[PDB]
Amino acid sequence: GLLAAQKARGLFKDFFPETGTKIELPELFPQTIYCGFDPTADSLHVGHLLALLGLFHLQRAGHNVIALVGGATARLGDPSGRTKEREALETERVRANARALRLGLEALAANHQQLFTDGRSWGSFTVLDNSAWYQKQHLVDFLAAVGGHFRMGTLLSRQSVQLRLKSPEGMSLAEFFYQVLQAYDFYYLFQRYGCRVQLGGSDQLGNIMSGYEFINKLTGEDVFGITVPLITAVWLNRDKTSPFELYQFFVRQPDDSVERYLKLFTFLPLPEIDHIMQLHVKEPERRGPQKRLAAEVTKLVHGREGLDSAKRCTQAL
Amino acid sequence: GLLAAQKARGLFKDFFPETGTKIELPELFDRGTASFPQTIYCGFDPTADSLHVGHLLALLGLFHLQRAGHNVIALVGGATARLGDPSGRTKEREALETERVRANARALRLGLEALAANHQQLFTDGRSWGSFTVLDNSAWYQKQHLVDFLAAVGGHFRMGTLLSRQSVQLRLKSPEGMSLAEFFYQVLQAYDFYYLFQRYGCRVQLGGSDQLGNIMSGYEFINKLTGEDVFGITVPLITAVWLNRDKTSPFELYQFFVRQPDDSVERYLKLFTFLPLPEIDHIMQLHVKEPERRGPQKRLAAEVTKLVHGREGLDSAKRCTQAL
Numbered sequence A: 001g002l003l004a005a006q007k008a009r010g011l012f013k014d015f016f017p018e019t020g021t022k023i024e025l026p027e028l029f030p031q032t033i034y035c036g037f038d039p040t041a042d043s044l045h046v047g048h049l050l051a052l053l054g055l056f057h058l059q060r061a062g063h064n065v066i067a068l069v070g071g072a073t074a075r076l077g078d079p080s081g082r083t084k085e086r087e088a089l090e091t092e093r094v095r096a097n098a099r100a101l102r103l104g105l106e107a108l109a110a111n112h113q114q115l116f117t118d119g120r121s122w123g124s125f126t127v128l129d130n131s132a133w134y135q136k137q138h139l140v141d142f143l144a145a146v147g148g149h150f151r152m153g154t155l156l157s158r159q160s161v162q163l164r165l166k167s168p169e170g171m172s173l174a175e176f177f178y179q180v181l182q183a184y185d186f187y188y189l190f191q192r193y194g195c196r197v198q199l200g201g202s203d204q205l206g207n208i209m210s211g212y213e214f215i216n217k218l219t220g221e222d223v224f225g226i227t228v229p230l231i232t233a234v235w236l237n238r239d240k241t242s243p244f245e246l247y248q249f250f251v252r253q254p255d256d257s258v259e260r261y262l263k264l265f266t267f268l269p270l271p272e273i274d275h276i277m278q279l280h281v282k283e284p285e286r287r288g289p290q291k292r293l294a295a296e297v298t299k300l301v302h303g304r305e306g307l308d309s310a311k312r313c314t315q316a317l
Numbered sequence B: 001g002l003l004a005a006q007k008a009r010g011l012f013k014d015f016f017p018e019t020g021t022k023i024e025l026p027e028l029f030d031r032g033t034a035s036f037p038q039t040i041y042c043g044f045d046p047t048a049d050s051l052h053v054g055h056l057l058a059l060l061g062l063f064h065l066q067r068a069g070h071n072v073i074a075l076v077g078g079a080t081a082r083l084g085d086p087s088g089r090t091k092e093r094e095a096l097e098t099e100r101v102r103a104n105a106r107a108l109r110l111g112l113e114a115l116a117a118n119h120q121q122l123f124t125d126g127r128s129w130g131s132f133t134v135l136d137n138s139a140w141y142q143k144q145h146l147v148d149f150l151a152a153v154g155g156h157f158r159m160g161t162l163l164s165r166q167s168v169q170l171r172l173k174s175p176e177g178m179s180l181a182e183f184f185y186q187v188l189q190a191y192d193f194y195y196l197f198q199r200y201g202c203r204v205q206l207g208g209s210d211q212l213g214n215i216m217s218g219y220e221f222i223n224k225l226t227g228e229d230v231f232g233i234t235v236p237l238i239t240a241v242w243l244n245r246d247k248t249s250p251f252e253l254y255q256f257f258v259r260q261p262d263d264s265v266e267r268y269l270k271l272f273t274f275l276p277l278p279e280i281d282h283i284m285q286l287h288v289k290e291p292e293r294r295g296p297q298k299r300l301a302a303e304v305t306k307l308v309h310g311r312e313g314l315d316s317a318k319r320c321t322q323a324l
């Protein structure tokens, strides 16, 4: 099964709520799944790709997926997993990054659709920007509508917010309110698109939790979250990281990690990865696993043209 | 000095910061030193379509400041009442409809201007008074988008100071807990202060003792952001009798005061009226000799009824009282 396969690959790390309450994810798995991306930079990087890949897998299986650009949330800054408060970002810069992210996400989905077809009937891929609905949201109207549905006790206790909340210098009201906006986003997408699932890296669990808890509080509806593992400077935009550098980053992965990366970053069937690995024991010199990993990812973010310059450049050298 | 006098009456129970400021509150109020006149505001939330006797004490505080030559603003919380102030309570108020709050706010603006009118026409004292203005915070919040607000001032409000307010610490402990909207309420009141300070040069906020925390959040936010000094003043909390004639008649209002117990009448005379303290003392001495006359109570009832309902209201009140 889809969930089963991704869990097996290691791409889907966990499913929530654990209780699953009324139902439980395996059961509803055309669903709509979304994942947000905050434009703190004018380019996505290799880590964000893992979350995007999670969406692609669901789309390939027939589900509709939404890649949300956080044009409004990036103005505040996600405190999840952070020790220090973020340097304030100019609104103008945030909107410029947002426009760039939207184009970046569409270019990736374009490469996906054109170079990784499998003849299956895929769901849709849509890029939205939360600033679309926040620019119409007035302060007090928002607080009067949904403010009573959030409990300070729950907000203050999220694990994701403890690093900043419990710091010696304290967290700002903006940092604290961030999770409310992400929770609202989930609720908004649930109401306008039937979105019942939100995917993100494990550092996003808290924000996702407040979202499904929020929605289950207003409606006895059940919605879920899926996290992807966090893998630990390599950008997806050619003007910051050329195809050659992106390719080299993957091609130089250690033998001990190369197999996990093939599972996480490519669409290659598990049985084929087994083959590439067994073939490797027999021919360490060819660096087959690494060459295959680099090719798949580079083709995904920079197309054939990019893959070609990438290989030709490495070969020449 | 204005502050000493009102402290003497028991009306201004507290004011702060006490020291550690370029110029202290007393000198800021002083006609001769530093600036003059100052601008002071007090917020009133239209959770009902009428003010009541408790709100009157806060209003009286403004009146006293206005009589000393300062400008006073009576703020109707058309936006804040949509949420509800959690201060001094353990129960989560059940919010009213936007439409209802809008109508209440309009009635309040009218009730406040009516009291101000009675004050200026019936309680002149020969001095040159400052102005009295009514504003509604919905005027600026209706132009505030959620994210623009959080981005603009969200970084200057610190969860630490916000979580520390006793009122807030009280609700977070209660078995019922606390909603996000009740928590955010103090941010709006704090912002209101900053906004009036910036636009009108308002440096003082007045409120009942339950407003201490909310006024403090204003002080912190303003100081943090501008390095400027602002102040708060609180009046005593007193123990529903409405100020709106069609909800509570002049006679009924009059009654609430005249039926007051001797053990409390003198305090009410000091808090609710403009009578000089020496006169209030004399009144209490005549009463100890002729308790039956209920002089203090009648004096108190007449003063307030006249301020709330004018001479016409007091006459009607007296007609009914005589009849009985």
Ligand SMILES: Nc1ncnc2c1ncn2[C@@H]1O[C@H](COS(=O)(=O)NC(=O)[C@@H](N)Cc2ccc(O)cc2)[C@@H](O)[C@H]1O
Residues within 6 Å of the ligand: A035, A036, A037, A038, A039, A040, A046, A047, A048, A050, A051, A068, A069, A070, A073, A078, A130, A181, A182, A183, A185, A186, A199, A200, A201, A202, A203, A204, A207, A228, A229, A230, A231, A232
């Ligand atoms: N190194 C990494 N490994 C794996 N996943 C990673 C990663 N670095 C980032 N990610 C994932 O990719 C996304 C991270 O990008 S982010 O722009 O840092 N994510 C965020 O800030 C989200 N709060 C954005 C958001 C989400 C939902 C909303 O409704 C609104 C905004 C998250 O899903 C994050 O978990």
Ligand SMILES: Nc1ncnc2c1ncn2[C@@H]1O[C@H](COS(=O)(=O)NC(=O)[C@@H](N)Cc2ccc(O)cc2)[C@@H](O)[C@H]1O
Residues within 6 Å of the ligand: B042, B043, B044, B045, B046, B047, B053, B054, B055, B057, B058, B075, B077, B080, B085, B137, B188, B189, B190, B192, B193, B206, B207, B208, B209, B210, B211, B214, B235, B236, B237, B238, B239
């Ligand atoms: N029983 C009572 N005795 C003495 N004073 C009383 C009282 N009942 C109310 N008051 C005072 O008169 C006002 C009470 O009215 S209230 O509508 O309940 N006040 C509030 O809720 C404020 N938070 C309104 C507010 C204040 C400032 C703003 O910028 C915005 C709104 C406060 O100053 C309160 O302390």
